[PDB]
Symmetry: D2
């Protein structure tokens, strides 16, 4: 309790994401890359038995961090401290551990595996947020409410129609995160110190084919589909820009959605879930973490821009901060957003009251236009006469509860007789919303359902705020 | 000369991109959108004559800003100012211009056309930058040189193998811009004030299928393949993040490439073209690429605080950021191509550097060889035995990855970039 | 109309700021630095007459840009193109033009003069914004209104008390901009190519004293108080961080103030000025330009970080973009903010109505606490009985207009008799606001008036939106 | 080892800054604020016994988080969770803990104390970094070397004259942090829920002068000189911009200095200390300085959208950004001092570089000399005649500017920075 701890790791993100970048995960993946490196070169006919491999396999999860810190505070080599620590627990394999590979073989490829597994943790949570909002969207598909532009009252829409506006942004984020996992991220493989594979060629007597095969077989055992061909020392750091840009994009989406909910809470039309007077505390927390996620990407674009030639180590420290925290911040935002979506309470009576109080004034443009075409040669008089009816109608609605007030007023004033027969539809809120209901139906069937169909066997998790 | 001018618009960027976001082109797109709207409504049955549509086509390219600036002064609303300016230039089509539409029908759709056309200007320049470095990489695929990690001498490589390392970045940049132009950017269409098409439903007496056809026909007349369907007032501003994110990625790529050239120039191994000396062009390229690198950070903030169906605090900043981002990327690609075309190498200076730094690199190979033979010969100091697969890596990469990526740009690779 | 133009230069910023960074201003300042350079070395007894100087003085404003572009598209030297153009118009002075100075002598020092003059354009506009808000703050010093936390109703404050919250931020910005003009920005002077003054020493036969005097006299004629001593080629670019950071800070202030006004417009308690139904278009425009100003600073901090040793030219292009646009964006924001402040309309009846509708529920915590100390041993019963009175009181206020409803209800219910004598004060809104009125008075007299006292002869300008 | 940990908190930053923002210290400050509040209210006449105040002092440093974590689970409000945790640890003082105060009385004031103390940790490290480079600059004030503009050889200078160029940046950084600690940061005090002190006015039966004295006494008991007077619920978050802006300025300064060292190391002129080789420490310093460089961009965004008297979307991000900014600056200053203490120079390597690059620098002086004598000698090639006032500039700068700036830190300059 005496040392500071980032609340992203201790409070806000899920346990699975926190462990995905843990030091134990890094070493177990380091030892898994050595097992794959061995069973790939042993596959290409080399002085590696099957006896050394299973001993590696049997001693993968266990790790002696004591000797690792002893070698790390002596020669100051994190990789070689673990190629020696692993050699102590694998006496038969020791000469054939990390055979021919450079340090970035275990460092870069393990980071790539962690980034991929990180996306596989986030993807179901994006789809869950989509699923929860989509259910609410068709629940309130016809719940008529006031639209707001400039934070001022505008023509009617429906609450479900507004939620689809939020879902659209999440669909773009799901698309981006799926392309990162399935296309953008490639394997680093075995490339040497400067990407020329000069050191692996010596181990294979200058046989280009076994060296190419070495990089091909390592890509399958790692679960990747291809690998970069012309790297320097590391995988092209531009990949880290693509990752954080997509994560920062999620932050922008979450910040807009939760700001909208905070705005709608001030109108008393919605209320976020709480524990069983109340403030939108969860949407506010989601905005703060989303803002932090939004701006974390500028560190990577500056880092990539100053990578010197074949490599420069000024990316090492910042990558172990920004990459895990971006994933931790994205994980915490989507956890909160799924909460808010699952428990968001809407108030139909408040929406109708706020709607009824503004409809007398929203309609004065459209009726005045129709009156002018019917012969209203005194446009200012006709407008002033309409504004008087609307102002008096808004008073009768509030104090007397007469909802159909403006209808009766204009029907009793035969100044507006040319449009008496058109008023029952002109004044119908179900007419003013346009195609709002049908737009929800097409959007859910044509775009939402295909996007999250592959996540059907993992949409059931209820996310809880603790 | 009295009023300050942005150097991006004044000199750095080419005039194609400069005019792509100009005001004249903007109202030409506004007028062309009103023509497509009239054609569509006439196609859907509305009483609009061919004489009115031919009248709009004829006076499309003639803009009288003196009238537009005048009516804008009283209106404070520039879209209607250009509506009634076109109505004056088209007395017959006057009652049907902008019929049933809202301001964002021309505001947002013209932006999407300018943004899509701006990408069409950038894309061949990315392809030329790729092709120019591709020629240098093959030309110097065997030019042995010193590789540097931590900016200190590392095991040898070839200059062409390093150039392909730059090209790999530009290849990822190319497909991002193509995905933007061919997939990410959708049309806004005719959605109304809050995206519910309530005004066009009224204009069509509630015919849902007419309003649907209106949006599909307009999307096709404008050259797009689809439109958003659950917008608020505007197209989702996340598209603006997507656009500026990819453009900022161009800057990061250009900055590293031109920084690598500045680094190698201090070793007298490479030299940028000119008419020792100053790498002025590579330095300007880094300067402009840095401004482009960070320009997207205001778009992510803008999107995050878009209130409900719309707030207008996106309008002024999009007028600045979006054109400047394209102008910055355009100027960087013009400089990068010119530098790539005239990239001078010095094999003798490269050779001497690898010679004076080789002692700090052979100590490992002689260690195991002395363990092999001698306990406790001239060609083991030969760097040609130490470059690995750098030669073959250039070949397969150029043949299997670079050539397919820019195959579609074969008809426009010849244009050389001249920096004066 | 065919070429793009930044709306900051053509629409949003003032003419005086646009011209402050114009190319004509740069050259006239270049020629002024040559006149000061000549009359400083002629002052130190050199082969420079008084005849060459006044010819320079007489031919300062005029500039032949034709020959300048002819020499610039031939040898590609912007400085030397103007040392030759000026030499053509000054035939007597030509050998003693730019005598001994490097290119950055005219480039850096002119930029410094432009940045200082830019701050002198902004400072009166910050003080004007302070003055306009301060007048409104004491106008509405006692105008009781609802405070808002989490965008939810909170205890009462006053509109003037809220405006002082805005003024406080502007006072910090005024302080920062005054320290930039009067302390942070130093003169670059004459330093040579790498700041060692090696080239000026040759012109003075190795006399350190005349070289030191040269830099001292040039600082006075330029209007600066001191100069940097150990520069490289240019003045330390960290100064550009300080400038843009303070300008970006103004953006944050303007964005918060105008977002608050947009929020208060949704409650119909305020309305920004318009032309003689309406949206807060000016506050929205001010937020967009403030957001652009907020983020423009990250380019400079990246630029300074990669300045290579004595100099690297990768700052030249970005400085002529970011520095003028930051000043232009700051100028446009303060122009808008002064407009909004001068014409901001408040609605006291709406504030009181929104206040009266929420006071029944704001007070239930404080009365319940007093009841418990008086013997209310059923806290939940007492709370539920209060919430029923408050809910019924809010209905009587809205429909019947009975403002003193909750008072009469609790006075007629002798369940709450122990606090009957304390209710007239407990329920007094003038009591609930605490020291809001007195805090406005002390803040205006003790902090606002001294801060803008030096701008008294320039607070009268009315800023107009065009 | 299973749960990920931030390397800033795990290794890079020293434990003084790490514990300065820890949770235990936070509630110790919360409890100390409640003690000062009780002392002040007793001083102003409220019925609070010395026995109750002595009870709070005695149990201040003993925190039982098991009780705090328990009551926080039901309350969801961590301030009251620690209120009634201290009430359990102080049965006598229980009815008067947090009396009349709101949550931000302890939340914001403890932050300001942690922020002010964090600056007090950073300031001597800035002074040591200044003093260490000051010693190298005087030691090498006459060490002639090659100056580089555009990273190409320029007219000669001395290594100490270049080191002072770095020091000039650190001097501006020093007075910024001092202005932050001594001027910019004010106390929040006892302002209430919306800053109007309405609750304390009620507690004091409306005595304006008592409430005024309450805020003045608390400001003095806490070690501050003044408090804000027209806040909303919190102190103005612009202070958080001011703080992170100055810390980001440290990163930009460290990044350029350590980049200059990396550049000079590729020329084998300088070398960072160790136990050719890798400038690992200068590279980590650049890496951490880059993260620190950009961390303020979320504070400027946070301030811009603070809604009216308060919105809570500042709380979570301030818990991350503010401590990490201090931790980043602390780690950078620890690395910069260690590099400055062991900065190795190589005068022979420096001399040879100026020799092999001198032809591209003397062409101008011989031009005017041949115009002088000869129409159309050995010591004109002597670089000691070409360094200008670089020697005297180091002297006056060190004597007249560096020594006064760090005079107040003379009692704490000896602590050496060891990087292992």
């Amino acid at each position: 309790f005496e040392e500071y701890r980032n609340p992203l790791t201790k409070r806000y993100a899920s346990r699975e994401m926190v462990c995905n970048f843990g030091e134990k995960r890094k070493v177990i993946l380091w030892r898994q890359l050595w097992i794959w490196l061995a069973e790939t070169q042993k596959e290409l006919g080399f002085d590696i038995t099957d006896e050394q491999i299973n001993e590696m396999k049997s001693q993968r999860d266990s790790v002696d961090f004591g000797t690792a810190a002893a070698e790390e505070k002596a020669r100051r080599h994190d990789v070689m401290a673990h190629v020696y620590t692993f050699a102590l627990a694998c006496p038969k394999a020791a000469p054939i551990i990390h055979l021919g590979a450079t340090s970035c073989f275990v460092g870069d490829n393990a980071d790539l595996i962690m980034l991929k597994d990180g996306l596989n943790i986030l993807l179901p949570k994006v789809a869950r947020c989509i699923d929860r909002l989509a259910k609410k969207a068709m629940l309130h598909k016809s719940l008529i409410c006031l639209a707001r532009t400039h934070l001022q009252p505008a023509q009617p829409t429906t609450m479900g129609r507004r939620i689809c506006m939020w879902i659209q942004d999440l669909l773009l984020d799901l698309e981006n995160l799926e392309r990162l996992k399935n296309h953008t991220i490639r394997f680093r493989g075995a490339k040497g110190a400067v990407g020329t594979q000069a050191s692996f060629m010596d181990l294979f007597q200058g046989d280009h084919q076994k060296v190419i095969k070495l990089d091909e077989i390592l890509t399958k055992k790692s679960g990747f589909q291809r690998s970069w061909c012309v790297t320097g020392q590391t995988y092209p750091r531009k990949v880290d820009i693509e990752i954080t840009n997509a994560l920062s994009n999620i932050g922008a989406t979450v910040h807009k959605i939760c700001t909208d909910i905070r705005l709608l809470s001030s109108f008393h039309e919605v209320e976020e879930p709480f524990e069983t007077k109340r403030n939108p505390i969860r949407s506010e927390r989601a905005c703060s973490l989303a803002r932090y996620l939004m701006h974390i990407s500028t560190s990577m674009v500056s880092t990539v821009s100053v990578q010197w030639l074949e490599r420069s180590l000024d990316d090492s420290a910042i990558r172990r901060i920004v990459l895990p925290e971006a994933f931790l911040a994205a994980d915490a935002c989507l956890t909160l957003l799924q909460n808010i979506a699952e428990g968001l309470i809407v108030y139909p009576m408040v929406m109708e009251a706020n709607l009824n109080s503004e409809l007398p004034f929203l309609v004065v443009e459209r009726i005045l236009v129709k009156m002018v075409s019917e012969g209203a040669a005194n446009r200012q008089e006709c407008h002033e006469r309409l504004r008087k009816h609307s102002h008096e109608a808004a008073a009768e609605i509030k104090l007397k509860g007469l909802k159909n007030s403006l209808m009766d007023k204009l029907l009793n004033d035969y100044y507006f007789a040319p449009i008496h027969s058109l008023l029952p539809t002109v004044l119908d809120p179900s007419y003013m919303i346009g195609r709002a209901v049908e737009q929800v139906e097409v959007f859910l069937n044509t775009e939402v359902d295909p996007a999250i169909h592959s996540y059907k066997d993992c949409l059931a998790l209820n996310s809880n705020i603790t």
